[PDB]
From a paper:
[name] ([name]) was isolated from a patient suffering from trichodysplasia spinulosa, a skin disease that can appear in severely immunocompromised patients. [name] has a 5232-nucleotide dsDNA genome encapsulated in its non-enveloped icosahedral capsid made up of the proteins [name], VP2 and VP3. As is typical for polyomaviruses, the [name] [name] monomer adopts the iconic jelly-roll fold with a conserved core comprising two β-sheets that are formed by strands B, I, D, G and C, H, E, F, respectively. We demonstrate here that the skin-tropic [name] binds sialylated glycans in a binding site formed by the BC2-loop on top of the [name] protein that is not utilized by any other structurally characterized member of the polyomavirus family.
Following cell attachment studies, we determined high-resolution X-ray structures of [name] [name] pentamers alone and in complex with glycans bearing α2,3- or α2,6-linked terminal Neu5Ac. For these experiments, [name] [name] was recombinantly expressed in E. coli. The [name] protein forms the characteristic homopentamer but cannot assemble further into viral capsids due to N- and C-terminal truncations of the expression construct. Extensive loops connect the strands on the top of the [name] pentamer and are named BC-, DE-, HI- and EF-loops according to the strands they connect. The long BC-loop folds into two different directions on top of the protein and is divided for clarity into BC1-loop, BC-linker and BC2-loop. The comparison of all seven structures reveals that [name] [name] does not differ drastically in its amino acid sequence, length and fold of the surface loops. The [name] [name] structure superposes on the BKPyV and JCPyV [name] structures with small root-mean-square deviation (RMSD) values of about 0.8 Å (calculated for Cα atoms of the [name] monomers). The groove forming the binding site for the terminal sialic acid in [name] of BKPyV and other polyomaviruses next to the HI-loop is still present on [name] [name]. With Y68 and L276, the equivalent region of [name] [name] is similarly hydrophobic. However, while the carboxylate group of Neu5Ac is recognized by two hydrogen bonds from side chains of residues S274 and T276 in BKPyV [name], similar interactions are not possible in [name] as the recognition of the sialic acid carboxylate group appears to be electrostatically hindered through residues D280 and D282.
Residue numbers in the entry:
A (entry chain D): 33 to 40, 42 to 100, 107 to 302
B (entry chain E): 32 to 101, 108 to 302
C (entry chain A): 33 to 303
D (entry chain C): 34 to 303
E (entry chain B): 33 to 102, 108 to 303
Amino acid sequence: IEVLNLVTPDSITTIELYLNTRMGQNDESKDNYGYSEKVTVANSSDQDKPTSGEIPTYSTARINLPMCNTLTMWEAVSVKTEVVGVSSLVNVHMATKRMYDDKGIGFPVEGMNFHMFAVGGEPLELQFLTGNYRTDYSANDKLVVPPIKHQSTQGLNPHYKQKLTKDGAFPVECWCPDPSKNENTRYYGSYTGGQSTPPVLQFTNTVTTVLLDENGVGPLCKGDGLYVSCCDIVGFLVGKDGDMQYRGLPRYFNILLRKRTVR
Amino acid sequence: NIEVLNLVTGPDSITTIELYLNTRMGQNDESKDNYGYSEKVTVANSSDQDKPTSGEIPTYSTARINLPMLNTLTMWEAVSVKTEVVGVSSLVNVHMATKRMYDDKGIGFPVEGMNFHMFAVGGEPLELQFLTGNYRTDYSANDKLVVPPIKHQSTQGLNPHYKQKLTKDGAFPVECWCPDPSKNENTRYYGSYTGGQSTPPVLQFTNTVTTVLLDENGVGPLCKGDGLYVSCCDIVGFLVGKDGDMQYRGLPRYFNILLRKRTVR
Amino acid sequence: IEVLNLVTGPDSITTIELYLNTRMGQNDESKDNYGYSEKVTVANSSDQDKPTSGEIPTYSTARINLPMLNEDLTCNTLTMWEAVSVKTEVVGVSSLVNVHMATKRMYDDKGIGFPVEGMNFHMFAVGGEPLELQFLTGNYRTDYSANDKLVVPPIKHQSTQGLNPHYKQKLTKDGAFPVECWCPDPSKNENTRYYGSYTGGQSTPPVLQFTNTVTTVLLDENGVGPLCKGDGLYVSCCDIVGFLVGKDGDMQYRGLPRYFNILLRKRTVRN
Amino acid sequence: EVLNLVTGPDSITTIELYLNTRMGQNDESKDNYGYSEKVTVANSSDQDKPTSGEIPTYSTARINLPMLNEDLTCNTLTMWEAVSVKTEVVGVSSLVNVHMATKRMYDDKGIGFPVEGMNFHMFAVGGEPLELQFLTGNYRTDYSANDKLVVPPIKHQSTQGLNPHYKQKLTKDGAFPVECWCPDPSKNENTRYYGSYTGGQSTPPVLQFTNTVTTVLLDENGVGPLCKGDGLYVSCCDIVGFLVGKDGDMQYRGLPRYFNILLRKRTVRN
Amino acid sequence: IEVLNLVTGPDSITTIELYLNTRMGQNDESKDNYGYSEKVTVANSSDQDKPTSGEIPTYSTARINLPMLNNTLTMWEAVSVKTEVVGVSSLVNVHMATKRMYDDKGIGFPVEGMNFHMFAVGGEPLELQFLTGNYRTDYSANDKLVVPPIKHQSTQGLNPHYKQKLTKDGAFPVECWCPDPSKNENTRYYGSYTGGQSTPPVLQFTNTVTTVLLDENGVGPLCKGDGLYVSCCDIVGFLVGKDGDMQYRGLPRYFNILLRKRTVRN
């Protein structure tokens, strides 16, 4: 894309949406919504076959935007995004393991934190990379995973790529953003690991993230499509008998766009 | 919402509002023992028998302040705020009747664990979204708590049919209500959470920090019907009794707000 | 105080240096355990919470006399000293590099002695009048009568576990106001700046910095610093860096001294 | 001796690449790739001889830049000057996995231990090999279980601090151990390197990934690494922690790194 | 000193480059425990607190002679420093003979616990204040340690009668000497402490960071008698032996200091 000038009233527009988490029980009408199923643990690396619904996936959505030598496209300028329902973590009376010889608080949701989001003019481009090349994903055929398995995929093998084109379908554990592509998408992410680690979270409606690149060009919405993706894991819920489930929270986006002429 | 015009200049164009809010950890009566704490935390046997006891549930603190009464109108516009947690030094106390370190010879455990700190300033009540860790939580032990009368599975995620307004102090549980980011155009909120079991509280206090409430366009919260809305929650951790029983501990918050006159269409 | 212009000329600025030693409970520099509290005790119940004499940290404070400015106190204008900035440091942080003291030790009595560790509390204030204090405690019933030299309210009440504005005081005495029940009153202190932090937990690593290259500006949003009433400069602080854990597990607060280097200038005020 | 920039079309160029991790099992056709072999522990400091493949090494590559063909007999020459780099750790999301054959929490009912503990992250971009200084926690370490490792031929007590007679250049991928080689601060004028270490036993890994951060490689004089012989040197190590096996066996886990480097032509004195 | 104009033009700037090796207690580079302390011992009681020889960390320091320079005189003025801790990557080693995780199947304990990092650059020796956690500490197992000749209860606080200047490498214990903030007008110092028992070390290394040494008036340390003084300490934790015995580990530090010629009144 050769980028021409901005169109100088009716030349900007806002898009609001939220994405609900995809931890593994992704049916809103059922119990454990917004959690994974019970986490299971492989007996050996060649019997690493997770149960259905115990694997978190990326959340994603495509939004439709309004529709010579010169053409106009929607340019994404900025985004205010925030994690919703952080305060739901101020809860230590649920049916959980508890502190101090069954006299103290219930363990709050705690441990692993993974927070990512992305905004672009096309689906987020993915790279396959996993901790265990032999992971068998066939307990849930709705997951999108490569048809073949190889030793090299525990590192970066560029023959194993994909595009985030489906909500609740791409496991975060084997797909990450492809840094060699995504020239038309902006992505930001963090991971805090460990076993019982304190979640450290913020929420405010005053923070704006500029999506313009180093030349003042935001993501350009191809075929007038805006692509928004995320994942937000805030820890594990610890059951009374020590069984554990991922907990994730939803994400909100407020995206400002403008009109931009291209060649 | 409101079509904004020019600022009013000259004398009497500025005013100030100073207040504090007391914590609402669950025992909220200032003449009862345990004021500024929750009652003892209890733990449900299963997720369909999740009924907290009366008073073990932290709620939001909030107040509405009447401001001076004043083609076009004039409204009070909130410009900035100096806000601080009060009584941080009270947590330097290890001689209370608590569990203690090192084979009963060491210090009392200080108040420690979960920290949750939020405050909001707006020209109307804080707009809320329901979201909970357990859609079945039964709040009927305390009929003063404001919660939805219908329980649904989808409220463990974001369901936008479950909204509310923060219009009563000491009644909206923090655990099920958060700021609605899809509204709150006329309010600024700021919040954080540090979890874990016995996590160190990390706290700061000073009278030298000003939070600017002006938005990207240089427009602060505009005070509808001459009302200013201030809300907060400040959990600093848990007090651990001798037998392991635990109570939330909260601290008060101070606000000093600067407001100016703004002309609107 | 109605504030006017700065006074210029070669006598317009002055500098004040001092340090304040810690007041952890054992506050006599000729005695053992100086710079620590006495052994911490633990109440049997909340209505028998009576700390032992010397187990309680208090604020360090001092009033410094400044050069006299006004001989005639019947003029339309007067001059006051105005605190512009302060360079302050915690002294002796390197002392915490010590794992050979008589302490509990790691790894079945073969490892290091526990270093001083746990709760940290750091605050300092510079003002032109005493730091104004608000009473707030974790236990309204706390009985201070083991040490009648502590300054505390004469009445107790449930409401003091929150903010009761009828329970206030001024920091007018070194080593006497307990940290656990007095904090800076944010509804006053118009003429003092304070800065404070707390890091809790049981065995928490202390995290401390020391340098001679950082200046804290004390001017407010309008460019006005603390104005020294009666030509008096008030400096206050507390610096708790953790607990020393004795061989049997008894524990003491440890504190460190603080240094202050303050720049002041002359300012004209209405009289 | 640096002079001014040159103008015109093709005064600029970009180089894009990634480097895979070198934790010990460095063969992409075999199991445990991207991990070390199980860590083993010496019985005494005079018998400290690690097994082959349990030892992390630096990743590195020389990249050929478009050739600057020119008369070598004149007053000036032209060099490629690295201006800036966008670099990120790839696959961070792979650490969101608690179902692998690992030790697990809460009396064998909870999650599998995620990859956790020691984190070591460095990258370097230069116009010649990264210059290395030898420094080890044990001077007696015996690397002779793997003769591919590049280490000094003699051992001396002084190598537990800085002995400047023990230096190297980082000229082979997967060969220079991290544990005994660090960047030499007394040289490397023509390289920029960045590093960090978070230690401890089971420490939460803290990681970020984005495509929006540029690292300026120009020094305080506005001069970037200058690529000798039209060669660009890129180096890294990204240890994200240990995998804990069911029985307590532990392996390093590392992750690949991406680089996108901007370079411009600069005139230098000949 | 009354500072006047800078000296301009050629040979008005110079650079100084050095490193300082750590002084953790075993400070003899030909011996096996170099760059560590001897094993830490723990006193039976505070009145019997006599550390063994070699288990005490001390400051590293050096004086560098600058080129001969000289109503008015010329002095060297330190403008900035680039400094880094060297050999951080050496802490990526969990196969040494040490205590280990998970019932003797897991990693060796890495070097961990207490971190203390400080450096100083000035035009005269760094001025010290005595302050200790235990006034009775008996240092006579090593009479090469420079400590006060007299002891008193008040030295667990700040007693300004107990001062020194950092004039010897590997001799002033870190546990009882700190920078004196009432002096050091002609030195810049920077330090941090992270304590705890087994705390993760958090360390950074880079050749791209410059520390400006000029004060608020644009004046850096002025090198009296053409002497530049550099001091540091870099403790990175403890090595835990198989039986639980522990020793301090330190790392060396590099400095690259830029100086300029400054005219001053005499």
